[PDB]
Every structure is written in C-alpha cells, then in structure tokens.
Amino acid sequence: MSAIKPDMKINLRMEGNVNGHHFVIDGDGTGKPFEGKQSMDLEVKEGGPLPFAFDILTTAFNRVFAEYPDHIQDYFKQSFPKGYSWERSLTFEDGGICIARNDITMEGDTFYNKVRFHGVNFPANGPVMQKKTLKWEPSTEKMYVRDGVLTGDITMALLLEGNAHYRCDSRTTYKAKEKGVKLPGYHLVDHCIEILSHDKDYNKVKLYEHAVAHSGLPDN
Amino acid sequence: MSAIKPDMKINLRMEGNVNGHHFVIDGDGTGKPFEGKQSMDLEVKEGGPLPFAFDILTTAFNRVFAEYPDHIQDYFKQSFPKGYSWERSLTFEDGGICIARNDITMEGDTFYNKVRFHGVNFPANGPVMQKKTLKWEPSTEKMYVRDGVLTGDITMALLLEGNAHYRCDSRTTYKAKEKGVKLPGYHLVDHCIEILSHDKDYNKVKLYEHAVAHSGLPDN
Amino acid sequence: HHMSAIKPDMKINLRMEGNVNGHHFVIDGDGTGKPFEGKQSMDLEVKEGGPLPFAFDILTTAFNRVFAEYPDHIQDYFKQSFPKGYSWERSLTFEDGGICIARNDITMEGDTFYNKVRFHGVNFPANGPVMQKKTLKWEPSTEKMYVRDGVLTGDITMALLLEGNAHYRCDSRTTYKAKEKGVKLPGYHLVDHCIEILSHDKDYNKVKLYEHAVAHSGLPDN
Amino acid sequence: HHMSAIKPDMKINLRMEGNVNGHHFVIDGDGTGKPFEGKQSMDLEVKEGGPLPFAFDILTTAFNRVFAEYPDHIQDYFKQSFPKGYSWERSLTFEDGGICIARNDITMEGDTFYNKVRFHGVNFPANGPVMQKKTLKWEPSTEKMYVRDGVLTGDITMALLLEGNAHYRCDSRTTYKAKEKGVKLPGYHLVDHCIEILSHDKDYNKVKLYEHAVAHSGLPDN
C-alpha cells in the first residue's frame, strides 16, 4: 500500500477553552513514523499568554509515529490514506477534567490535524492554574479492544516543583474512517514527551515525542 | 432586594458535540425564581435528529430558580444584575464523560444563557447511544465551599427501560461575576426535572424543573 | 408479606473487630432505639487498640437501616427481612486515596438486635485529616436506594466537616441481602440521614452515638 | 559493612487468611526465588474454604518487590530494608464495583522470607466475571513508583483477560513502608511485571505461580 513514507510533515490547528479561557494554537513540524519520532513548532495565535500550564495540552499535540514490531498489528498505519480520529478524557486527581478530540487526514506527504480541547474545574490554587508543572514522566499506554473499539488506557504523572507528582487518568478511543481495518490484540506502548525550547510566556514552544510498541515481559 | 422579578424570561442557546456529532439547540421559557420552578421550549436547529439520548442534556438547560429559606445565604440571587457562570463535568459509570459550561447574564426581565456541551467515549451499545433512557430520578445536590469557590456535588441516576438505573457523578463550580458576594455554608438542594412533551424525534422539547434548598435532617 | 416481629422499643448489641493502617482494635456497643420512628443511640467502648490513632468518625457509619421511618407506599425491605435477618457489605472511598471495606451480619433474638461488624482500611496518608485527627462531624446526607444486578444497593456521597471549615469527601456503596426467601425488592427511593456524637472522653475510648433516618420519594411527592 | 542480607537463592514462606463476599479461607505457600534476577515460584495449597467460589486470579498479586531486577542507577528500596523487613498496603478497585484490600508483613530469617498476608473483598456481583470464573490471566503491566507524603507509592493499572477475548479492568495502588528509618527513598521509575499460573487442579486447590519483574527508567532506551 505504501501510503506512509519515512519522512512526513505535520500540520495542526487547535481551538480550545480551559476554565473559560479561549485560545487558538498552530502547529508545524515533521516526524519519522517507522522510527516513532516526531517534532513540532507550536505558536499561540489567540489567547496568549495562556493563564495555565502548557503541559496539560502536550499529549493532545498521533499514534502513527510509533515503532511497531512485526508481531503486532499496526492499526494506525493501515487506516491510511483515508485517516482516523480519536477521543480522549483526562481526569486529574484534584478534580480537573479535560476532553480532547482530533480528526487526522493525509494528502501527499503531510498530515492534517484538527484538534478540539476543553477542560473545567481546575482549582485556582492548584498546580495547573499556578503553572507549577515541570514535565510529563515516562508512561506506558495499554492498547485493548472494547466494544469493537480500540481503547487506550494510561495513568500518567506530571512532575511538580518540589519533587511532587500530579496524577492523571487517561482513556482514548481510536476509530478508523474506513470499514475493515483489523483490530490488534493486547499490547503496550511506551511514551516519552518533552518540551525542548520555549519563550517566557510559552507563546512559542518546540515539542518532541518518542514512542515504541511492545508485548511486555518477558519480550523486551 | 432584587433585581430578580417574581416572573422572569429565559433565553438560551447551546452549541455542542457528542461522540463527534455537532448540534445546536435554542431555548425559550419562563420561571418563578422564589418558588424554584421554571419551564422551557427547546428546538433542535442543527444536527437533528440527535443520534443519542436527549436526557443527558437536560441538566445543562441556573440555580436562581430554587426556593431558598431565609436562614440560608442565596449566592445566586445575590449575583445579579451582573450575573454568574458555572462549569460542570459529568462522569457516567461506563466511561462516557461530559463537560459543560454556561455564562448567565441579565437584561431587563430576561436571563440570557450561553451553553457549551462536550462528551466523548460513549459506548456504541450503551444506553445513551441506544436511546434507552426514560427520565432522571429525583436527586439532592450538596453545596459546600472548596478552594474559595462554591461547589455542588450530586450523584444522579437515569432510569432505563426495564426499571434499571444508570449512574452519573456530577461536579459543578459556581463563579459570581463580581467579587464581594458572600459565600454560603453547607446546605442541600432538592431537584426534580421532567420532560412534559416532545415529538418522536425529540426535535421539539418542553422541559420543567422544581428545586428547593434546605439544611437537611433533623428538621429541614 | 409476613409479620416483622419488631417492637416499638428494641435493644442493640454490637461487636466490631477492625484494622486501619495496620492498627488492630476491638470495640463493643450497647444501645437502644425506636425502629418505626427511625431513631437509635448506642454506647461505644474500645476494648483493644485504645487509644485509636485515627479519627473516630470513619467508623460511625458502620455502627442498621431497620432504624428508619418508612412510609406506606414504599417497600420496607429491612423490616421485612426479620425475624431471620440480613447482612450488608460496604466500601468507603475517600478523596485522598483512603479506602475502607466493611461488613455486618445482623440477627434478632427476643427484643435485641445483634451485630457482628468487620472493618478494614488502607492507604490513609500520614498527614491527612484521618491520621491527624482533624475531623469534626458528618454532614447531613441523602442515600439512594435502587436495585443493581438483582441486589438492593445504597449510594451516598458524604462529606466530613474538618477544622477550618473544610470538607472531606467520601463515596459509599452498600449491598443488602436478606437471609430469608421471598422478600420483595423496593423501587427507587431516598433516605435522609443524620448522625452525630453526643459525648466522648478526650481519647474517644467511650463514645455515645446518635442517628435519625427518614425515607421518602423525593420531589415533588415527599 | 560486610555481606548483604539478600542471597542469590532464597526461599519463601507465606500464610494468607482472607474473606471475599463473606467466604472465609486460608492458604499456605512455599517457594524459592532469585532476587537479583527478579524471578520467583511458589506452591500454594488451600487449607480452609476449599473450593473457592471466586476466580483465583484476583489473589495472585497478593502472593514481594524484593524479587525485581534493579539496575545501578535506580535506588533499590526493597533490598535495602532487610534483614528487618517491610510491609505494604494495597487497594484493588475493579470496574464493576468489586473492591479489595490487602496487607503483607514481610520478615527474614537466614535464607527464608516470611510473609503474613491478609485479604478482604466485597460487592462482587453474582453475574460478574469473578464469581462466574471467566478469568484467564493477568496481562503484562507496568507499575509506577513515586513518593507521596514521604511514603513510596506504587500505582499500577492492570487488566484481566476474560473468556472470549474480553478484558476486565482494575486499578491498584500500593504503599510501601520499611520498618527501619533511614532507608533512602528512590526517585520516579517503572517496574515491568509478568505473572502467570503454571499448573493447577480442577478446583484450584493446588496452584503453581510464577512472576518476573524488571525495573527501569522508561524511554528512551531504558
């Protein structure tokens, strides 16, 4: 089928609202799907500077960029050239809850992402509205089928100032646009996301991700 | 002294997206604030007929309509003519999660509502996407202060066909537009919402609510 | 269906063995109550593990829905479960990760109810309100009774008043099972609750507890 | 200091008493393991309460993080807590309302670990996969180790494979506490797990269990 090439470009646009603050962010970058790496340049067009921690938006900024071994079905590379979409909920330990959504399409060598983001109930004295986050810690996503839908469960932790951690529970559902794409079996996906550079107000940010899929012990 | 009249008008516009489906609803009704009763005529302008259960929207369709006794601070009537807003998350037991927000203003004898609704991860064979809901059961909302913000917790239940119940946990935060409104103490608010009439596609709906505030046992 | 054999004045006899954060304890109870009026009181005494290193309030809910005023139009599943009795299982999930499970087997002989309660909790933080003894009281609450998987279930989201006008959340769920065949299952209804500690010494080795509970159908009926 | 308290080949002795949905049981365990390789095997025998009316798989993770392969750049909190030992508390939250708590007090003598385990569960529905015995195994999982309130905490989110390629969801959290003060707490890290039943009779009165655990720092390359 080909469709996916070793070097592909990414184009992204996000419109969102968190605790009543509207914002718009643009994204531009490239990535290596078969090696599971990608980078993007992010710029805030509306709502800058953001009154909350930028780290709660980073994982909404494509599982096509993941190294898949031969013994595990790649549900996301086979959903193309037509594409797919996903829906995610983010439940934080202090009551903050977010909801994300992304429609992914491809034409030529460029991926086009249309993202929506919405969060509510972050406390004013909490680390999110006070911008006390440092980074996401490494995480392992669980892939399994539920009600004929590929579902991803993952419990992440933000690192805070003072060597504290901030719990978040995530659940994502993936739906291919065309009928007939084979669903995979149970497997794990390792994740690593990191901000490389940013200005003082995070109007411009450079993001990076590395992701690899595996079967777990003892097959690592 | 009010501000609020014994008979007020209600004007409401809602935009939303549930499981990827976009929709637009308009509302027009009246209500008696000091008796805690209101009614509204709803009409689906875009996205009709709705492919999901209409019931999951009715609690997003104002605590000004609630009977408050004298010994309990009435945070919501003290918020006008300036107004207030609220944010809410709905966590259904089978993984469906909704977030909601509404900005309430006042002009003359009319309340103006701007509502946003977003939900994700509803199972395709669940009671919501299968339209197996009948009504909301009577419920009691808890009102207390959390991080300097008035908060309402309530564990509701939807009656399904066959007399089964579908649980949902709700969490709402209320923010007055002007600083200086005295926050209340712990109390409770009884709720009762009911659809009076509808077409068979739920494109036109007539909604009704009755709510009463009290202190709980052993007297009120 | 049949007769309750419940008198207007009943006695209560209770024994609880438990373990919270690794601390073992045994507490005995003795009291009286009026079932048809939904009121009951008990004198508690710690026999082992005193003085308790945790807040006493987390136990008071474990210390019988027979003591609840039921109207005529709602099925009274608990007074119909006698003279044979019933039992319940409960889980208490607190907002800072503390989780408790409880269990009680209730029988009746003569005019006295007998209770055998077990209580276990783990993962309460060392600096949390429970291990620091910063609780004040439970706030009034309303319990949801409904049938779930053929078993009568009770749902409550309670709140503990803390020092400084803070509140401590707790999510509770109880399943009720009658020991006799043929007890009718009720429909959806609510039960208002009120519990408070009347008196106590300063180490909570001796406590006097009180409760009032009334069932209704919610708005706009009752 | 001289020799380490941990040997390359160590034996395991275990005793568990518990109660699930009102059913009491007692199980004994005997096994061996290689702590530095992160592997252990055990032979289990039900002494009381056989046969168990629930799925055996819900007990297997209660049957010692000493058996884990720890690299040099990650602090090994569990091997440093001996010869005195440590304890842990755990809560298991299943997606259909079943809730479990567990304890274990671990000591050491010679080449043998001693385990004293308690287990309690409530509110498993009669039509659920645990009471119907429709579970097959635990899937491979990854445990998150981090500090919370000065206590090492392990957050793990597991999944049981069911008959018919369905999965049963479970949330678990463990707190670890060493009996000696002064053990250096580790930073954030991950622990890969693999648990599996090797053999069993028809009623699961005799079970052979095996686990493999490895600690690492997560991506990249770790």
PDB file of N, CA and C in Angstrom, chain A residues 61-131:
ATOM      1  N   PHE A  61      -1.229  17.192  21.380  1.00  0.00           N
ATOM      2  CA  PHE A  61      -0.416  17.570  20.231  1.00  0.00           C
ATOM      3  C   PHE A  61       0.266  16.341  19.637  1.00  0.00           C
ATOM      4  N   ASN A  62      -0.841  11.670  17.707  1.00  0.00           N
ATOM      5  CA  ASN A  62      -0.932  10.776  16.559  1.00  0.00           C
ATOM      6  C   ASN A  62      -0.102   9.522  16.802  1.00  0.00           C
ATOM      7  N   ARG A  63      -0.774   8.379  16.945  1.00  0.00           N
ATOM      8  CA  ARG A  63      -0.086   7.121  17.202  1.00  0.00           C
ATOM      9  C   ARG A  63       0.515   6.508  15.942  1.00  0.00           C
ATOM     10  N   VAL A  64       0.433   7.197  14.802  1.00  0.00           N
ATOM     11  CA  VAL A  64       1.140   6.735  13.614  1.00  0.00           C
ATOM     12  C   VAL A  64       2.643   6.815  13.842  1.00  0.00           C
ATOM     13  N   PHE A  65       3.091   7.800  14.620  1.00  0.00           N
ATOM     14  CA  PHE A  65       4.502   7.937  14.980  1.00  0.00           C
ATOM     15  C   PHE A  65       4.778   7.051  16.192  1.00  0.00           C
ATOM     16  N   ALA A  66       4.937   5.758  15.915  1.00  0.00           N
ATOM     17  CA  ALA A  66       5.272   4.774  16.936  1.00  0.00           C
ATOM     18  C   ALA A  66       5.930   3.587  16.252  1.00  0.00           C
ATOM     19  N   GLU A  67       7.028   3.102  16.825  1.00  0.00           N
ATOM     20  CA  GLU A  67       7.754   1.973  16.253  1.00  0.00           C
ATOM     21  C   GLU A  67       7.001   0.687  16.572  1.00  0.00           C
ATOM     22  N   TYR A  68       6.446   0.053  15.545  1.00  0.00           N
ATOM     23  CA  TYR A  68       5.707  -1.183  15.765  1.00  0.00           C
ATOM     24  C   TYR A  68       6.510  -2.379  15.285  1.00  0.00           C
ATOM     25  N   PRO A  69       6.648  -3.423  16.097  1.00  0.00           N
ATOM     26  CA  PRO A  69       7.350  -4.630  15.652  1.00  0.00           C
ATOM     27  C   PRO A  69       6.486  -5.469  14.716  1.00  0.00           C
ATOM     28  N   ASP A  70       7.111  -6.512  14.165  1.00  0.00           N
ATOM     29  CA  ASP A  70       6.457  -7.308  13.130  1.00  0.00           C
ATOM     30  C   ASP A  70       5.323  -8.159  13.684  1.00  0.00           C
ATOM     31  N   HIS A  71       5.384  -8.535  14.958  1.00  0.00           N
ATOM     32  CA  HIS A  71       4.406  -9.453  15.525  1.00  0.00           C
ATOM     33  C   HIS A  71       3.172  -8.754  16.076  1.00  0.00           C
ATOM     34  N   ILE A  72       3.065  -7.438  15.922  1.00  0.00           N
ATOM     35  CA  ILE A  72       1.953  -6.670  16.465  1.00  0.00           C
ATOM     36  C   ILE A  72       1.302  -5.890  15.332  1.00  0.00           C
ATOM     37  N   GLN A  73      -0.018  -6.023  15.214  1.00  0.00           N
ATOM     38  CA  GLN A  73      -0.764  -5.336  14.168  1.00  0.00           C
ATOM     39  C   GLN A  73      -0.702  -3.829  14.372  1.00  0.00           C
ATOM     40  N   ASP A  74      -0.414  -3.100  13.296  1.00  0.00           N
ATOM     41  CA  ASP A  74      -0.365  -1.640  13.326  1.00  0.00           C
ATOM     42  C   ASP A  74      -1.718  -1.127  12.845  1.00  0.00           C
ATOM     43  N   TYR A  75      -2.587  -0.776  13.795  1.00  0.00           N
ATOM     44  CA  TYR A  75      -3.925  -0.321  13.437  1.00  0.00           C
ATOM     45  C   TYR A  75      -3.905   1.063  12.802  1.00  0.00           C
ATOM     46  N   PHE A  76      -2.899   1.875  13.117  1.00  0.00           N
ATOM     47  CA  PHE A  76      -2.904   3.276  12.712  1.00  0.00           C
ATOM     48  C   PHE A  76      -2.226   3.514  11.371  1.00  0.00           C
ATOM     49  N   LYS A  77      -1.190   2.742  11.035  1.00  0.00           N
ATOM     50  CA  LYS A  77      -0.568   2.899   9.727  1.00  0.00           C
ATOM     51  C   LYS A  77      -1.412   2.298   8.613  1.00  0.00           C
ATOM     52  N   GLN A  78      -2.337   1.398   8.942  1.00  0.00           N
ATOM     53  CA  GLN A  78      -3.201   0.789   7.941  1.00  0.00           C
ATOM     54  C   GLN A  78      -4.526   1.518   7.768  1.00  0.00           C
ATOM     55  N   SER A  79      -4.831   2.489   8.624  1.00  0.00           N
ATOM     56  CA  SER A  79      -6.023   3.308   8.459  1.00  0.00           C
ATOM     57  C   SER A  79      -5.841   4.409   7.418  1.00  0.00           C
ATOM     58  N   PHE A  80      -4.716   4.418   6.711  1.00  0.00           N
ATOM     59  CA  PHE A  80      -4.442   5.438   5.708  1.00  0.00           C
ATOM     60  C   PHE A  80      -4.446   4.812   4.312  1.00  0.00           C
ATOM     61  N   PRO A  81      -4.562   5.632   3.252  1.00  0.00           N
ATOM     62  CA  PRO A  81      -4.540   7.099   3.155  1.00  0.00           C
ATOM     63  C   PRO A  81      -5.795   7.849   3.619  1.00  0.00           C
ATOM     64  N   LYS A  82      -6.823   7.164   4.125  1.00  0.00           N
ATOM     65  CA  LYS A  82      -8.058   7.876   4.435  1.00  0.00           C
ATOM     66  C   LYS A  82      -8.056   8.521   5.818  1.00  0.00           C
ATOM     67  N   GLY A  83      -7.449   7.892   6.816  1.00  0.00           N
ATOM     68  CA  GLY A  83      -7.252   8.517   8.112  1.00  0.00           C
ATOM     69  C   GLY A  83      -8.095   7.885   9.205  1.00  0.00           C
ATOM     70  N   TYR A  84      -8.136   8.579  10.343  1.00  0.00           N
ATOM     71  CA  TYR A  84      -8.852   8.107  11.523  1.00  0.00           C
ATOM     72  C   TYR A  84      -9.060   9.282  12.471  1.00  0.00           C
ATOM     73  N   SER A  85      -9.701   9.003  13.606  1.00  0.00           N
ATOM     74  CA  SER A  85      -9.940  10.017  14.623  1.00  0.00           C
ATOM     75  C   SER A  85      -9.885   9.367  15.998  1.00  0.00           C
ATOM     76  N   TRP A  86      -9.735  10.205  17.024  1.00  0.00           N
ATOM     77  CA  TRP A  86      -9.715   9.718  18.396  1.00  0.00           C
ATOM     78  C   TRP A  86     -10.414  10.703  19.324  1.00  0.00           C
ATOM     79  N   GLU A  87     -10.792  10.193  20.496  1.00  0.00           N
ATOM     80  CA  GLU A  87     -11.438  10.963  21.547  1.00  0.00           C
ATOM     81  C   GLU A  87     -10.823  10.559  22.876  1.00  0.00           C
ATOM     82  N   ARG A  88     -10.540  11.546  23.722  1.00  0.00           N
ATOM     83  CA  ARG A  88      -9.801  11.311  24.952  1.00  0.00           C
ATOM     84  C   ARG A  88     -10.445  12.071  26.101  1.00  0.00           C
ATOM     85  N   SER A  89     -10.374  11.481  27.291  1.00  0.00           N
ATOM     86  CA  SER A  89     -10.742  12.158  28.525  1.00  0.00           C
ATOM     87  C   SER A  89      -9.545  12.151  29.464  1.00  0.00           C
ATOM     88  N   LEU A  90      -9.348  13.264  30.167  1.00  0.00           N
ATOM     89  CA  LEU A  90      -8.232  13.448  31.090  1.00  0.00           C
ATOM     90  C   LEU A  90      -8.806  13.784  32.459  1.00  0.00           C
ATOM     91  N   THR A  91      -8.659  12.866  33.411  1.00  0.00           N
ATOM     92  CA  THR A  91      -9.203  13.026  34.757  1.00  0.00           C
ATOM     93  C   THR A  91      -8.044  13.207  35.729  1.00  0.00           C
ATOM     94  N   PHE A  92      -7.895  14.420  36.249  1.00  0.00           N
ATOM     95  CA  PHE A  92      -6.829  14.724  37.189  1.00  0.00           C
ATOM     96  C   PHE A  92      -7.286  14.449  38.618  1.00  0.00           C
ATOM     97  N   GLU A  93      -6.307  14.326  39.517  1.00  0.00           N
ATOM     98  CA  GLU A  93      -6.604  13.867  40.869  1.00  0.00           C
ATOM     99  C   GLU A  93      -7.298  14.922  41.721  1.00  0.00           C
ATOM    100  N   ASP A  94      -7.189  16.200  41.367  1.00  0.00           N
ATOM    101  CA  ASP A  94      -7.790  17.270  42.149  1.00  0.00           C
ATOM    102  C   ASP A  94      -9.130  17.731  41.586  1.00  0.00           C
ATOM    103  N   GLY A  95      -9.663  17.040  40.579  1.00  0.00           N
ATOM    104  CA  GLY A  95     -10.956  17.349  40.011  1.00  0.00           C
ATOM    105  C   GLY A  95     -10.909  17.926  38.613  1.00  0.00           C
ATOM    106  N   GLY A  96      -9.752  18.407  38.167  1.00  0.00           N
ATOM    107  CA  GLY A  96      -9.639  18.917  36.815  1.00  0.00           C
ATOM    108  C   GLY A  96      -9.919  17.842  35.788  1.00  0.00           C
ATOM    109  N   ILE A  97     -10.800  18.127  34.833  1.00  0.00           N
ATOM    110  CA  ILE A  97     -11.186  17.161  33.811  1.00  0.00           C
ATOM    111  C   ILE A  97     -11.124  17.839  32.450  1.00  0.00           C
ATOM    112  N   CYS A  98     -10.458  17.190  31.495  1.00  0.00           N
ATOM    113  CA  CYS A  98     -10.316  17.696  30.139  1.00  0.00           C
ATOM    114  C   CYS A  98     -10.908  16.708  29.141  1.00  0.00           C
ATOM    115  N   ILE A  99     -11.206  17.211  27.944  1.00  0.00           N
ATOM    116  CA  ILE A  99     -11.789  16.416  26.868  1.00  0.00           C
ATOM    117  C   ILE A  99     -11.175  16.877  25.552  1.00  0.00           C
ATOM    118  N   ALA A 100     -10.562  15.950  24.819  1.00  0.00           N
ATOM    119  CA  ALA A 100      -9.855  16.262  23.587  1.00  0.00           C
ATOM    120  C   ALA A 100     -10.442  15.478  22.418  1.00  0.00           C
ATOM    121  N   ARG A 101     -10.138  15.942  21.209  1.00  0.00           N
ATOM    122  CA  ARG A 101     -10.656  15.315  20.003  1.00  0.00           C
ATOM    123  C   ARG A 101      -9.819  15.773  18.819  1.00  0.00           C
ATOM    124  N   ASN A 102      -9.585  14.860  17.881  1.00  0.00           N
ATOM    125  CA  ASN A 102      -8.700  15.121  16.751  1.00  0.00           C
ATOM    126  C   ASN A 102      -9.120  14.294  15.546  1.00  0.00           C
ATOM    127  N   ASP A 103      -9.316  14.964  14.412  1.00  0.00           N
ATOM    128  CA  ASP A 103      -9.576  14.323  13.130  1.00  0.00           C
ATOM    129  C   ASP A 103      -8.317  14.417  12.282  1.00  0.00           C
ATOM    130  N   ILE A 104      -7.781  13.267  11.882  1.00  0.00           N
ATOM    131  CA  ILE A 104      -6.496  13.186  11.195  1.00  0.00           C
ATOM    132  C   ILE A 104      -6.732  12.760   9.753  1.00  0.00           C
ATOM    133  N   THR A 105      -6.196  13.538   8.815  1.00  0.00           N
ATOM    134  CA  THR A 105      -6.245  13.222   7.396  1.00  0.00           C
ATOM    135  C   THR A 105      -4.855  13.385   6.800  1.00  0.00           C
ATOM    136  N   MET A 106      -4.697  12.887   5.578  1.00  0.00           N
ATOM    137  CA  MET A 106      -3.406  12.883   4.909  1.00  0.00           C
ATOM    138  C   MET A 106      -3.614  13.141   3.428  1.00  0.00           C
ATOM    139  N   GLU A 107      -2.803  14.034   2.867  1.00  0.00           N
ATOM    140  CA  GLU A 107      -2.778  14.279   1.430  1.00  0.00           C
ATOM    141  C   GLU A 107      -1.337  14.525   1.020  1.00  0.00           C
ATOM    142  N   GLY A 108      -0.815  13.673   0.144  1.00  0.00           N
ATOM    143  CA  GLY A 108       0.579  13.759  -0.239  1.00  0.00           C
ATOM    144  C   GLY A 108       1.497  13.230   0.842  1.00  0.00           C
ATOM    145  N   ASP A 109       2.329  14.106   1.407  1.00  0.00           N
ATOM    146  CA  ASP A 109       3.269  13.727   2.454  1.00  0.00           C
ATOM    147  C   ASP A 109       3.034  14.502   3.745  1.00  0.00           C
ATOM    148  N   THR A 110       1.839  15.062   3.925  1.00  0.00           N
ATOM    149  CA  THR A 110       1.539  15.927   5.058  1.00  0.00           C
ATOM    150  C   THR A 110       0.324  15.399   5.804  1.00  0.00           C
ATOM    151  N   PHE A 111       0.432  15.324   7.128  1.00  0.00           N
ATOM    152  CA  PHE A 111      -0.704  15.006   7.982  1.00  0.00           C
ATOM    153  C   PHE A 111      -1.396  16.290   8.418  1.00  0.00           C
ATOM    154  N   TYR A 112      -2.727  16.269   8.411  1.00  0.00           N
ATOM    155  CA  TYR A 112      -3.535  17.417   8.805  1.00  0.00           C
ATOM    156  C   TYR A 112      -4.357  17.049  10.031  1.00  0.00           C
ATOM    157  N   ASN A 113      -4.146  17.778  11.122  1.00  0.00           N
ATOM    158  CA  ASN A 113      -4.822  17.528  12.387  1.00  0.00           C
ATOM    159  C   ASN A 113      -5.763  18.680  12.716  1.00  0.00           C
ATOM    160  N   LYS A 114      -6.968  18.337  13.160  1.00  0.00           N
ATOM    161  CA  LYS A 114      -7.975  19.308  13.586  1.00  0.00           C
ATOM    162  C   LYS A 114      -8.341  18.955  15.024  1.00  0.00           C
ATOM    163  N   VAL A 115      -7.828  19.723  15.980  1.00  0.00           N
ATOM    164  CA  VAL A 115      -7.898  19.374  17.394  1.00  0.00           C
ATOM    165  C   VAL A 115      -8.907  20.274  18.096  1.00  0.00           C
ATOM    166  N   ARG A 116      -9.633  19.696  19.052  1.00  0.00           N
ATOM    167  CA  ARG A 116     -10.510  20.422  19.957  1.00  0.00           C
ATOM    168  C   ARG A 116     -10.150  20.041  21.384  1.00  0.00           C
ATOM    169  N   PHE A 117     -10.148  21.025  22.282  1.00  0.00           N
ATOM    170  CA  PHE A 117      -9.726  20.812  23.659  1.00  0.00           C
ATOM    171  C   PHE A 117     -10.649  21.576  24.595  1.00  0.00           C
ATOM    172  N   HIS A 118     -11.032  20.938  25.699  1.00  0.00           N
ATOM    173  CA  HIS A 118     -11.933  21.559  26.662  1.00  0.00           C
ATOM    174  C   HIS A 118     -11.652  21.001  28.050  1.00  0.00           C
ATOM    175  N   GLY A 119     -11.472  21.890  29.019  1.00  0.00           N
ATOM    176  CA  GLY A 119     -11.261  21.479  30.396  1.00  0.00           C
ATOM    177  C   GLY A 119     -12.034  22.371  31.345  1.00  0.00           C
ATOM    178  N   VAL A 120     -12.380  21.808  32.509  1.00  0.00           N
ATOM    179  CA  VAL A 120     -13.128  22.530  33.533  1.00  0.00           C
ATOM    180  C   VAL A 120     -12.643  22.119  34.918  1.00  0.00           C
ATOM    181  N   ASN A 121     -12.972  22.963  35.900  1.00  0.00           N
ATOM    182  CA  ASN A 121     -12.879  22.649  37.327  1.00  0.00           C
ATOM    183  C   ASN A 121     -11.442  22.507  37.825  1.00  0.00           C
ATOM    184  N   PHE A 122     -10.496  23.196  37.209  1.00  0.00           N
ATOM    185  CA  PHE A 122      -9.168  23.273  37.808  1.00  0.00           C
ATOM    186  C   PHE A 122      -9.187  24.280  38.954  1.00  0.00           C
ATOM    187  N   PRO A 123      -8.769  23.893  40.158  1.00  0.00           N
ATOM    188  CA  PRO A 123      -8.778  24.841  41.278  1.00  0.00           C
ATOM    189  C   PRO A 123      -7.795  25.980  41.060  1.00  0.00           C
ATOM    190  N   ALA A 124      -8.151  27.149  41.598  1.00  0.00           N
ATOM    191  CA  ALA A 124      -7.313  28.330  41.413  1.00  0.00           C
ATOM    192  C   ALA A 124      -5.965  28.183  42.106  1.00  0.00           C
ATOM    193  N   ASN A 125      -5.929  27.507  43.251  1.00  0.00           N
ATOM    194  CA  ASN A 125      -4.697  27.283  43.991  1.00  0.00           C
ATOM    195  C   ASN A 125      -4.008  25.981  43.609  1.00  0.00           C
ATOM    196  N   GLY A 126      -4.403  25.360  42.501  1.00  0.00           N
ATOM    197  CA  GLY A 126      -3.812  24.115  42.071  1.00  0.00           C
ATOM    198  C   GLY A 126      -2.610  24.330  41.175  1.00  0.00           C
ATOM    199  N   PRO A 127      -1.803  23.283  40.989  1.00  0.00           N
ATOM    200  CA  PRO A 127      -0.560  23.443  40.215  1.00  0.00           C
ATOM    201  C   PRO A 127      -0.781  23.817  38.758  1.00  0.00           C
ATOM    202  N   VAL A 128      -1.969  23.567  38.204  1.00  0.00           N
ATOM    203  CA  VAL A 128      -2.221  23.883  36.801  1.00  0.00           C
ATOM    204  C   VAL A 128      -2.429  25.381  36.609  1.00  0.00           C
ATOM    205  N   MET A 129      -3.334  25.979  37.389  1.00  0.00           N
ATOM    206  CA  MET A 129      -3.573  27.413  37.283  1.00  0.00           C
ATOM    207  C   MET A 129      -2.430  28.234  37.866  1.00  0.00           C
ATOM    208  N   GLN A 130      -1.548  27.617  38.647  1.00  0.00           N
ATOM    209  CA  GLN A 130      -0.389  28.299  39.201  1.00  0.00           C
ATOM    210  C   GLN A 130       0.884  28.042  38.406  1.00  0.00           C
ATOM    211  N   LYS A 131       0.811  27.225  37.353  1.00  0.00           N
ATOM    212  CA  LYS A 131       1.948  26.939  36.472  1.00  0.00           C
ATOM    213  C   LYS A 131       3.144  26.389  37.253  1.00  0.00           C
TER     214      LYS A 131
END
